[PDB]
Ligand binder design. Structure first.
Ligand code: FES
Ligand code: K
Ligand code: K
Ligand code: MG
Ligand code: MG
Ligand code: MG
Ligand code: MG
Ligand code: MG
Ligand code: MG
Ligand code: MG
Ligand code: MG
Ligand code: MG
Ligand code: MG
Ligand code: MG
Ligand code: MG
Ligand code: MG
Ligand code: MG
Ligand code: MG
Ligand code: MG
Ligand code: MG
Ligand code: MG
Ligand code: MG
Ligand code: MG
Lengths: 86, 74, 117, 122, 48, 72, 97, 23, 128, 137
RNA sequence: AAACUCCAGUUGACACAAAAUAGACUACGAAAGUGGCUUUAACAUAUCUGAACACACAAUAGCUAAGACCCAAACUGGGAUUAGAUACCCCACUAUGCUUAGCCCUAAACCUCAACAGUUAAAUCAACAAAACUGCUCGCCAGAACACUACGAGCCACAGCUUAAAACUCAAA
């Protein structure tokens, strides 16, 4: 309200490509967490429920990041079998 | 499996036996059924690798002990 | 960097209250989730209204709206092939690093060992 | 203790700005403060619009006053700045140079936690 | 050593005698606390 | 080993030699090992300073024709 | 006994601990140029330490400095001050494809 | 665990509170 | 309380502190310091007045004096903060821990126990 | 010069122009994308209303207002009334995550207006009023 | 559908309400709790255990008195749904949530895992969960149900809280 306008969350359109500008803006708002924040602010999330959600989301990140680390570690072994027939 | 061919040849050359393939359940503890009532089991099992291809002990290590067969193993 | 798990779970020896309350043990499975689908959304509606917009102005006379109709007709044909091509792309596995069944055979060869042998 | 007064003043001409600083530094001295230095950070556009004393402000003069004062002077000074119509926003903080930064050896890596679950077969 | 360093600084403190002179001297000068850091950990002072 | 201290400094000062390790030859000697052997010889001659015993060693090898390109 | 036996000592090849880009440097709330390097250009959101690469000690100092500077009248809250958009990019985040 | 013991106590307390209100 | 002009415990024994400018004396006095610095001066006064060795801080006497200074600070805090339940607990716990110190000092050194009670103004009471 | 997605800052000297008008002078299309209805108002850079169109003003009612095609129709209507007043280039400021968030922008383009920038102004309280309780379904 | 059209959108002015991001951090406090900014005061114990006979605390809801009031919201009213709908869904609004001063003293107040010291040695180990134990101390427990009940006593509590049985019944829980 008291800040300057047309600086925050503003993406310029290039060559009239409004589809790509909107995707960039939506990608910006998502990466900064605003979309999930706005979605979670439509109905009050009580603190017990918010604490449960944060735990679930934090445990999911740990599992997903560790599973991703193992996939990248083993991907070199996806090469053809060197000892085919034995 | 890098050495399956090498080991299979060494066994034939020395006049002995090699099992470098997937080890089926009961080759030793159920040998009479799989081969016949008069099948003679090995008197000595030599492990050049004691682990299977999932980094666990080869099942034949336990099954050799069950049948009271001495094992040599690297 | 994976978030820390030191002092996060309720355990003997951990004085603080637990940071995390996982309903499942934090142990990597030997499989990954299936290649899920994106729930379909209606297509070509932008072309649909150009056809229907001209219909209203020209009293639903096709002759006047031939160009707007050919647009919607072509858009629907492309979406019917694009959907079918999407299925072929799914089998190819180009989008993903590996197919879930090809990525699970690889995990079958290096299974997580949460126990002692 | 040693404090740092972050002072945003109404954008004014040099004569009225000098009178405000003198009137503000004298208020500090009247409360027992020992003023150490006065630094001008320059006039600039505010990061957002600030309403103060029935006026809207978009520019201000940023000044710092380094001083020592008894602990009882802070509360009394904050009240003084609230009534000065030429002050947009004034904050008194403990001087950052008093807090000495401890030495840092670097980033100690955190190993993946072990023995979180029994080794029984599941 | 801290009392010696502090005893010299007190010479440059503001007093009711030099207050008007120190105010005008401040209005003529500019102090800049801005500087940036790089991916290599190097400070990039402002262009002034 | 005691020489590991000399090896850590040599790799820091001069880096890994552009000459390639040949781990198949059981008697291979790298530039670092050649440096360590000279460093050990000069220590046995009575020199005990560390920073001085390290600079004199580099000179000896340069005299022998060895290439020692300082990393920095 | 024997000269060739291993000897007990500390790892001579151990690498020095890594340091954050702000290790050993003072973080002041008045240095808005520095603080602006750790907020989102579009939303003003403070970047997490996984984006800034800072240690816990400096991630806290930067956070506390930003919050102080914002409400004291030194730093905008809803966007990065455009004056600082051309400063060195020290954070690991890309918003354009 | 199931909540069958909690449920027994739940009904007892409900009926008691209701009895007190009635009398 | 010690006068505000009192120097800090750290700067009282530096050579030449009596010949420095008055401004420098104000900056090294209690007036320009937090209350915790005034409590360090109060602890020092009690030590010289009561304990035989004012430099031994691990004796049961010094602990009773150190804790007695904390107890008085809690009372002054609570005089202005009467709904601060956290510090009310610290006060009540500290009073109980001094009584446990006084009990053990009374059992071990009665002559010193009497000097501690007179010096600090403590009226020892036997529990009910 | 390379393209900058960051808008030109007022008071600085930019070279970008649209029909000889600076960024600060381009009219603004305010799109309110609610969960049920989309509202579009085109105002001048001096905050003078030029055109307004909502899904309800285009004859949609109840759940039909909360559709993408309903917002697209509102965009075309606002674009038509705005073009008559001399509007070609507009700055779009969309607040809300409703279904007509993107569709309303398409209608503005199909109606003859050129979008030079997109701004999100969805209200996000930083701690604010307590929202209504969660619905059981 | 009802409701509102002194309604909606733009802009400016704009709080005794609540505190995005940081936080992938895991810190503080005895616990309850504590994540906007500044300052002030400030975080017991130089052995450990230890009060249900005491003292001081204790989320939320609630009571009493005086204020504030954006938003939310038991109850209630209307709309819809339904065989019914004293619900779930929609709208409006109050107690209440907030401040001040007193009360009330309860939570799945549970991380259902006591404080202090120590061990990984084995005879590891019902099962599951969050591996198995040693020393020492306090607290507590002894089939289910009756029973977070009755009676007694205490209490600013009066449809309350704490302490807390028995008879009858079952062969299980
Ligand atoms: S790593 Fe040293 S302060 Fe960050
Ligand atoms: K906040
Ligand atoms: K629990
Ligand atoms: Mg223990
Ligand atoms: Mg569970
Ligand atoms: Mg269950
Ligand atoms: Mg019952
Ligand atoms: Mg359901
Ligand atoms: Mg109606
Ligand atoms: Mg105790
Ligand atoms: Mg107790
Ligand atoms: Mg309570
Ligand atoms: Mg209340
Ligand atoms: Mg309301
Ligand atoms: Mg009703
Ligand atoms: Mg109300
Ligand atoms: Mg409040
Ligand atoms: Mg709790
Ligand atoms: Mg319990
Ligand atoms: Mg206990
Ligand atoms: Mg109860
Ligand atoms: Mg009762
Ligand atoms: Mg009774």
């Amino acid at each position: 309200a008291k800040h300057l306008k047309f600086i925050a969350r503003t993406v310029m359109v290039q060559e009239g490509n409004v589809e790509s500008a909107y995707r960039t803006l939506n990608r910006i708002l998502t990466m900064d967490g605003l979309i999930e924040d706005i979605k979670h602010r439509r109905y009050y999330e009580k603190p017990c429920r918010r604490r449960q959600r944060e735990s679930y989301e934090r445990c999911r990140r740990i599992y997903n990041m560790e599973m991703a680390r193992k996939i990248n570690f083993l991907m070199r072994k996806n090469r053809a079998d060197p000892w085919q027939g034995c | 499996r890098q050495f399956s061919y090498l080991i299979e040849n060494m066994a034939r050359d020395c006049g002995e036996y090699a099992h470098t393939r997937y080890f089926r359940g009961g080759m030793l503890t159920n040998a009479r059924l799989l081969f016949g009532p008069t099948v003679r089991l090995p008197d000595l099992i030599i492990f050049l690798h004691t682990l299977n291809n999932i980094f666990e002990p080869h099942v034949a290590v336990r099954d050799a002990a069950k049948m009271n067969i001495p094992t040599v193993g690297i | 960097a994976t978030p820390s798990l030191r002092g996060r779970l309720a355990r003997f020896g951990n004085p603080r209250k637990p940071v995390l309350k996982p309903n499942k043990p934090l142990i990597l499975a030997n499989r990954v989730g299936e290649r899920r689908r994106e729930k379909g959304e209606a297509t070509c509606i932008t072309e649909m209204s150009v056809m229907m917009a001209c219909w209203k102005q020209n009293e639903f006379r096709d002759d006047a709206c031939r160009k707007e109709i050919q647009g919607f007709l072509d858009c629907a044909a492309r979406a019917q092939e694009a959907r079918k091509m999407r299925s072929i792309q799914e089998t190819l596995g180009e989008s993903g690093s590996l197919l879930p069944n090809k990525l699970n055979k690889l995990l079958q060869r290096f299974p997580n060992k949460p126990y002692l042998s | 203790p040693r404090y740092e007064l972050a002072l945003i003043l109404k954008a004014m001409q040099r004569p009225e700005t000098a009178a405000t600083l003198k009137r503000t530094i004298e208020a500090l001295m009247d409360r027992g403060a020992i003023v150490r230095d006065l630094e001008n950070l320059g006039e600039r556009a505010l990061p957002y619009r600030i309403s103060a004393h029935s006026q809207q402000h978009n520019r201000g003069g940023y000044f710092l006053v380094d001083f020592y004062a008894p602990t009882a002077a802070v509360e009394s000074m904050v009240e003084h700045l609230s009534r000065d119509i030429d002050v947009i926003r004034g904050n008194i903080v403990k001087h950052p140079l008093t807090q000495e930064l401890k030495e840092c050896e670097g980033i100690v890596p955190v190993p993946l936690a072990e023995k979180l679950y029994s080794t029984k077969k599941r | 050593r801290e009392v010696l360093q502090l005893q010299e600084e007190v010479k440059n403190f503001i007093t009711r005698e030099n207050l008007e002179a120190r105010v005008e001297a401040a209005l003529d000068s500019r102090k800049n606390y801005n500087w940036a850091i790089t991916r290599e950990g190097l400070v990039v002072r402002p262009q002034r | 080993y005691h020489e590991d201290r000399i090896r850590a400094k040599f790799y820091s000062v001069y880096g890994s030699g552009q000459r390639a390790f040949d781990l198949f030859n059981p008697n291979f000697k790298s530039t670092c090992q050649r440096f360590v052997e000279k460093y050990t010889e000069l220590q046995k001659l009575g020199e005990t300073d560390e920073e001085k015993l390290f600079v004199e060693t580099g000179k000896a090898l340069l005299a022998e024709g060895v290439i020692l390109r300082r990393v920095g | 006994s024997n000269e060739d036996l291993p000897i007990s000592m500390e790892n001579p090849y151990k690498e020095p601990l890594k340091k954050c880009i702000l290790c050993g440097k003072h973080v002041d709330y008045k240095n808005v140029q520095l603080l602006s390097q750790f907020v989102s250009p579009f939303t003003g959101c403070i970047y997490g330490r996984h984006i800034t690469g800072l240690c816990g000690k400096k991630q806290k100092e930067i956070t506390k400095a930003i919050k102080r500077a914002q409400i004291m009248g030194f730093m905008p809250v809803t966007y990065k001050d455009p004056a600082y958009l051309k400063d060195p990019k020290v954070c690991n985040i890309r918003y354009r494809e | 665990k199931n909540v069958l013991k909690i449920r027994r106590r739940k009904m007892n307390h409900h009926k008691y509170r209701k009895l007190v209100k009635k009398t | 309380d010690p006068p505000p002009s009192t120097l800090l415990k750290d700067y009282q024994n530096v050579p030449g502190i009596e010949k420095v400018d008055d401004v420098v004396k104000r900056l090294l006095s209690l007036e320009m310091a937090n209350k915790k610095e005034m409590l360090k001066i109060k602890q020092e006064q009690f030590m010289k007045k009561i304990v035989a060795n004012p430099e031994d801080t691990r004796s049961l006497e010094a602990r009773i004096i150190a804790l007695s200074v904390k107890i008085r600070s809690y009372e002054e805090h609570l005089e202005k903060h009467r709904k601060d339940k956290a510090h009310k607990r610290y006060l009540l716990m500290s009073i109980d821990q001094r009584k446990k110190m006084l009990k053990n000092l009374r059992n071990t050194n009665y002559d010193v126990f009497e000097k501690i009670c007179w010096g600090l103004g403590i009226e020892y009471t036997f529990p009910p | 010069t390379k393209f900058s997605i960051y808008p030109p800052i007022p008071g600085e000297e930019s070279s970008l122009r649209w029909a000889g008008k600076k960024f600060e002078e381009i009219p603004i299309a305010h799109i309110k994308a609610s969960h049920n209805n989309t509202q579009i108002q085109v105002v001048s850079a001096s905050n003078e209303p030029l055109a307004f169109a909502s899904c309800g003003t285009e004859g949609f009612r109840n759940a039909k207002k909360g559709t993408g095609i309903a917002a697209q129709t509102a965009g075309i209507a606002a674009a038509a009334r705005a073009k008559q007043k001399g509007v070609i280039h507009i700055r779009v400021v969309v607040k809300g995550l409703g279904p007509g968030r993107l569709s309303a922008m398409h209608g503005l383009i199909m109606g003859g207006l050129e979008v030079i920038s997109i701004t999100d102004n969805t209200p996000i309280p930083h701690x604010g009023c307590r929202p209504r309780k969660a619905r059981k379904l």
